[PDB]
Amino acid sequence: MDVTIQHPWFKRTLGPFYPSRLFDQFFGEGLFEYDLLPFLSSTISPYYRQSLFRTVLDSGISEVRSDRDKFVIFLDVKHFSPEDLTVKVQDDFVEIHGKHNERQDDHGYISREFHRRYRLPSNVDQSALSCSLSADGMLTFCGPKIQTGLDATHAERAIPVSREEK
Amino acid sequence: MDVTIQHPWFKRTLGPFYPSRLFDQFFGEGLFEYDLLPFLSSTISPYYRQSLFRTVLDSGISEVRSDRDKFVIFLDVKHFSPEDLTVKVQDDFVEIHGKHNERQDDHGYISREFHRRYRLPSNVDQSALSCSLSADGMLTFCGPKIQTGLDATHAERAIPVSREEK
Amino acid sequence: MDVTIQHPWFKRTLGPFYPSRLFDQFFGEGLFEYDLLPFLSSTISPYYRQSLFRTVLDSGISEVRSDRDKFVIFLDVKHFSPEDLTVKVQDDFVEIHGKHNERQDDHGYISREFHRRYRLPSNVDQSALSCSLSADGMLTFCGPKIQTGLDATHAERAIPVSREEK
Amino acid sequence: MDVTIQHPWFKRTLGPFYPSRLFDQFFGEGLFEYDLLPFLSSTISPYYRQSLFRTVLDSGISEVRSDRDKFVIFLDVKHFSPEDLTVKVQDDFVEIHGKHNERQDDHGYISREFHRRYRLPSNVDQSALSCSLSADGMLTFCGPKIQTGLDATHAERAIPVSREEK
Amino acid sequence: MDVTIQHPWFKRTLGPFYPSRLFDQFFGEGLFEYDLLPFLSSTISPYYRQSLFRTVLDSGISEVRSDRDKFVIFLDVKHFSPEDLTVKVQDDFVEIHGKHNERQDDHGYISREFHRRYRLPSNVDQSALSCSLSADGMLTFCGPKIQTGLDATHAERAIPVSREEK
Amino acid sequence: MDVTIQHPWFKRTLGPFYPSRLFDQFFGEGLFEYDLLPFLSSTISPYYRQSLFRTVLDSGISEVRSDRDKFVIFLDVKHFSPEDLTVKVQDDFVEIHGKHNERQDDHGYISREFHRRYRLPSNVDQSALSCSLSADGMLTFCGPKIQTGLDATHAERAIPVSREEK
């Protein structure tokens, strides 16, 4: 994954897821279953074993990483460019879609695609989360919680598609 | 618990259970829830935290213990005698009922009772399980599976009330 | 018645214690040478106180303590709350009677019950009586010997459970 | 066509380778011285093979290897199975086309897709072609250079996935 | 015055112481037985011484000690020197009165002050009185009971601080 | 101190302071010286040686403690009550004033006082700082920075005199 351990891881585990069944298986037996997813849821348980876880974490897939203050998602990014990737929230998941073409060896022709979804552990706030893209094609998720903490309340809104710090 | 670790534990965780719610819581946020229980079933997722787991394990109450080949249940047995306790199967649980009277300090008069139920992690066979009583009043459950293993299939039948090896 | 018565028982216491030384120481015383022786015782017053022884005592059925600083009946209560018990003094003796519901294991459901009497000595101030759950999880029914000078009178009364612990 | 063509691419291859030485060685041649120168180549044949360168180439999207013992196109497949791919040779070039479902993270659901072409050299025996998942988790589409001596003819055919690995 | 016165215171011482034982031882014584018581014482013387218781015482405000070998009022002085204190005996009681400047933390400036009285028993020889800073950093104001024999008379005098420690 | 270591410590150282011278011385030679204080500032340087430183921391005096998110100040609080103590800001310091009278041994008469000042390390915000008092008489400083961080900008305002969490 890486991140750390604890505590976170656990958370991661938781996120992862639961259912159981797965867881149951592982364990054993037982029973059953459961729871679932839704968102819220997340849861756890733890585981580891698964595978898924591984894938988540790492393986293939990619990778996940978890702290108290943030959960970070690092990708296994064979070349897509920063322009090909898109970020949005759906169903307590961070959604990613992409399409890229690349040159190789003894003449090929390549199309390359993916569509990813990643949950956040219960200490993570989905509404507050933001998600950004580095130059390798590597998404790395630093989404402000202003500092650390708890917020479980969440449900969807749109995230800015931004070039990344990490 | 003891037993072991692983594996078981886881199983244990598973078992435990888951538901878721618880788981858721723990877990966280888420969502839811669941599943349941039943049995079968069980589961888861794981856790631990719761408590329950613790209780379971251990504590109180008494105590639980788990292996692959058996699950063993050891009691916090302030004096009842071996005659006061009863063993049977009900709803993927080992049932125990008791009543005892004892002398103390600056004249009291005592009645003492309990009614216990314990699930088995599904790697345990409830139909094959047997349960026995030692001299301290301590139930300790060694119930033949002939050796180790899997049997999930179970539903109730009567267990012999036997004085124990452990 | 108381014283013477016481013684027876116481014785137981013584026885153991025885030785011586213790016683012485206590017482013172011484021684012787031778060688040886034885132881012682016373018545018035017584012683018781111481405690140681108580413890031881405890044993079972109990454990008891009662020093120079207070007079007490400790009862092994770790399955129960003090609220499932109600305490009354009748025919120069304390009667503590308890009946509690089934407590969850993630496995199943487990109750106890008791009907207890212990004689409080001529030395206890029964109008001071209170009902507490102690550090061991034993219910401490206490009428304090607030001063080490002897023989504050025993008499009948009913006690609703106000948490004393202590 | 193939051759021449191739160349352119191749160239680438050459360138680276260239140186020379380577071429020378291868071639051888030578140277121158111067210072320076340148370278170478061739045509016829071519160369391629070587592988180384491839590886470187890879660057992304891949990694390629193709030695004296065999000709191969490795593809970075760790998200996919070889069964989600179907391989056919068309207009003196290998076309590997893959589309897979979403794989579970305990978090969520993640797919990829690709539409790939790579040119196989005049030196590959295309009637020998097989489809395997390698040790790296890369799909190795191989027509063997069973003997080191040069230039077995390329031609079109469709390949159902029979697991080759290897 | 012283014585017675013383016582018242012482017572315281016683118371515691018371117891016783112581016382016884011382014384021685024883015781018673018764129961108781118381214581013782014485016156014259016384015782015182022882010491143981014191220691316891201490318681615071102080800690006090006074044995068979000497009679003492210990005072918790660790912020102060014995030179910031001046000691006088008035109306069969010792009056230790202290007022000190601010001591540096690398952070800032911190003072204390006190106006103290402590009755010395009929058994202290007050013409022997000395003023010391002890091992704990407590000011030990002592008139010795150089022999394990009873009741060397109390009377008024003013004491400039000559370092006694001891 | 504690807291932691680293880173914181350184811061702490620073804060411390320176011047130178012282330184120178130591140283040587040379030269010278220076420067111064003022506030702003702080510074430184460283140383150791011185012493112062020691004181601061701791010593005494009392005690200090430091983290990134807060600096905590724990006192050596022989009995003053929660009513006798006062909290305010002066010159990048937390000011404290107090007066208390207490019963002792073989009849004394006691007055007891203090006046404290404590700097904050520069990663601490003095304007945002609050400072609170527990039941032992122990001031413990938890002052919202909403979460962790930097703010050096500070100059004085009044802090609420509140009963404490820690």
Add this chain to the structure above:
Amino acid sequence: MDVTIQHPWFKRTLGPFYPSRLFDQFFGEGLFEYDLLPFLSSTISPYYRQSLFRTVLDSGISEVRSDRDKFVIFLDVKHFSPEDLTVKVQDDFVEIHGKHNERQDDHGYISREFHRRYRLPSNVDQSALSCSLSADGMLTFCGPKIQTGLDATHAERAIPVSREEK
């Protein structure tokens, strides 16, 4: 550085220186410133862271090294000869000046220069210090203090330019 440780270283631381412023730055915040130178111175413171320281140490530059009895300064001496270097005291520093020409590769023409100043720690006597040159172009500072020790008093005088022991 070386030387040683212690012691020285421381020283060284111282030285170184212171112023513061430076220281412051480292430291933181705060304041411032211162112182111165012168020388013386030285112173211281321590531281370481620055660068310066470284440078110082080381570176470049060069390197520093520190003991109680001497501070030694080792240089990153790409070829200068023993004749090109000069030693004197200025402003609690050892001064060094140089100019050398060297043959290289595919015809170059080289001039090479440096002008260094090095402080001594407070434990070091600048007036007593001497500084010498080995065959590699490496200055190494062994300057009699007759044995070990303290002398802080220093201000300038001329050092003999001697070929070195170390």
Add this chain to the structure above:
Amino acid sequence: MDVTIQHPWFKRTLGPFYPSRLFDQFFGEGLFEYDLLPFLSSTISPYYRQSLFRTVLDSGISEVRSDRDKFVIFLDVKHFSPEDLTVKVQDDFVEIHGKHNERQDDHGYISREFHRRYRLPSNVDQSALSCSLSADGMLTFCGPKIQTGLDATHAERAIPVSREEK
């Protein structure tokens, strides 16, 4: 061987055887011787030484291995195929007979044979034992005892020549 240780071884030783012688030787011385063988036986013783033882084990020969539940016999199987080997019981031993022809280097002509006998420890049942053959030509003995245990009673019967799990 391986196986284981124990227990077984022882067983083984035983088995072885024884014888012784042888043883013785060884032883020584012484014584012787023885025883033887037869069977039964076984035884033882133881041883160783022887040778034888060685052879056984191982050586050649081959190799042996022992557990409570089974004894496993692994062979040093330069190429015979699975068809060339035969399994039977004789005199508390597992019998094996074989004949194979193979191509080598600068033209040879090869015949290759063996005739083996292996005892079992007294914990092992010879009547219940079965013995199977893997693809390398490696006999590996897993013979049901249904689970673990004791049976020493044994005397011969025919074993199925089966392709192996291990």
Add this chain to the structure above:
Amino acid sequence: MDVTIQHPWFKRTLGPFYPSRLFDQFFGEGLFEYDLLPFLSSTISPYYRQSLFRTVLDSGISEVRSDRDKFVIFLDVKHFSPEDLTVKVQDDFVEIHGKHNERQDDHGYISREFHRRYRLPSNVDQSALSCSLSADGMLTFCGPKIQTGLDATHAERAIPVSREEK
């Protein structure tokens, strides 16, 4: 035983022885047875278981101990004196016979006896062996082999009854 171881031881074883048966037982089954013884022888085877061885060783009985160069036999020698014990060779054994009377507690009258035989391991020479008695009643066997070694040839002859080195 011782010785040584070886070687020885073885030886020882051886010785021882063887036878066877024883052885067978232880062883088982087877067968047877044876052878033886013788010786030679020884042887062885071885064882241880046885026882024886133881015883041887030781125881018672007594005790044994083994080396290459000698085998040493230490007794559990409740009071016999050095005069009551006898040493001779019979059937690759060291023979011991005894009778003693002793005063005790609230008037008894005592007779006390024993008759012992001890084999030597193979690497021991029985013809060369000597055996001696210490002040506690403890026989300790140091019998010259002029140094270490092998001699297995042995059959009986008389040993000097000597007071011992160990």
Add this chain to the structure above:
Amino acid sequence: MDVTIQHPWFKRTLGPFYPSRLFDQFFGEGLFEYDLLPFLSSTISPYYRQSLFRTVLDSGISEVRSDRDKFVIFLDVKHFSPEDLTVKVQDDFVEIHGKHNERQDDHGYISREFHRRYRLPSNVDQSALSCSLSADGMLTFCGPKIQTGLDATHAERAIPVSREEK
């Protein structure tokens, strides 16, 4: 011784011485022777053985102690006073003469004397050595070598009888 060683021682041785022878022785054988012584021486050678040486040282006797820069001689000084002891050099030894009378238990009458000689290791200068006496009656030798070192040349002169630092 112481010181230282070386160187020284050686030285020481040386010283021582030578021678041778012684030485031778121682130684052886051869041868022778121677140478021576012377011184120178020383030477040486160485041784131782022786014784011586022782013584030386120481023884016684007393005690010795060694370093590079000094050799220190500590005495087992049951009460002589500082006035009863004398220090001088004879034959690469430090000479000591004494006579004291002391009160004891159930009326005795005591005279107490000694006459000591102590060599110095080769690294020590006897002409430069000085030797001093502390309040316990404990001679402790700190004799200036201005700092550390070698001086072997020595033959006698008078040492000042001084009260000591150590």
Add this chain to the structure above:
Amino acid sequence: MDVTIQHPWFKRTLGPFYPSRLFDQFFGEGLFEYDLLPFLSSTISPYYRQSLFRTVLDSGISEVRSDRDKFVIFLDVKHFSPEDLTVKVQDDFVEIHGKHNERQDDHGYISREFHRRYRLPSNVDQSALSCSLSADGMLTFCGPKIQTGLDATHAERAIPVSREEK
């Protein structure tokens, strides 16, 4: 040386030777121276320174080695044959004389000689010692002491020139 140681050585130383111167130277110073030678011786012383021683040982030379029971001397034996070397006793030393011619590289003409003397540690008997020569030209000294031990008494006699065990 070787051987051884011781013882031886021482021885050785021784030986050686011584012377012274030477021684012285160484030583120183011183012174011276012475012684021577012778022987014886030885011685021683021781130483160583020376150278020587160385040478011784060783140276050239060769080498030495030491035990209680024998001292062994191993030579750095570039090719001499076993026929070229001679063994005798002179002045508590083992004497060795030799002359050999050997082919080399781009036509040389070689004569090669040595004359050695080796002391024995005092626990060695020179009269009982024997010394032997292995195939590499390596003298290795095993000289009967029938077993281990002490004999210091020695003065010269002739040793058999024997081919060696070690």
